[PDB]
Amino acid sequence: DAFVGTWKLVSSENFDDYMKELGVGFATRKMGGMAKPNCIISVNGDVITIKTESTLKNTEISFILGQEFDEVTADDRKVKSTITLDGGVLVQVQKWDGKSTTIKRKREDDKLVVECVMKGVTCTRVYERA
Numbered sequence: 001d002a003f004v005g006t007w008k009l010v011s012s013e014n015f016d017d018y019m020k021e022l023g024v025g026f027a028t029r030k031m032g033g034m035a036k037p038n039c040i041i042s043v044n045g046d047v048i049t050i051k052t053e054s055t056l057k058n059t060e061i062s063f064i065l066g067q068e069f070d071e072v073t074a075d076d077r078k079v080k081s082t083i084t085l086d087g088g089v090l091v092q093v094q095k096w097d098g099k100s101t102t103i104k105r106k107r108e109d110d111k112l113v114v115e116c117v118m119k120g121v122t123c124t125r126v127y128e129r130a
């Protein structure tokens, strides 16, 4: 929809702190930090697919809005994820071991803005069309 497309990471703030707050170890944070992924968002019927592709790591999720699904994250957490659309924002929550983190995806001007929150840490990542 407004989200559909092939997006390239152009800026990131506080991603290392965000991964640290999630408990990600040094090697995986290193890989993640200097990744510059593409994010490819598509929709077919009820099903949204978000692929995140980079030289050292790829992930993919497919989901129906409002329906919980299992996910293995890029940092290898096994989580229960639910994604909803709220005022134009795709809101993802991941739940595991009594914790949660939120990842909000929104469209702003030419940007796909990704805000990731874990406890007191807020990370902002910005994608632009490829």
Ligand SMILES: O=C(O)c1cc(Oc2ccccc2)c(OCC(F)(F)F)nc1C(F)(F)F
Binding pocket: 018, 019, 022, 024, 032, 035, 037, 039, 052, 053, 054, 057, 058, 059, 073, 074, 075, 103, 114, 116, 125
């Ligand atoms: O889409 C993102 O840019 C993104 C990318 C992530 O990791 C990568 C890095 C390279 C390739 C594919 C995935 C990631 O990992 C979970 C983490 F951060 F906990 F490790 N989380 C996110 C986000 F939080 F924002 F959704």
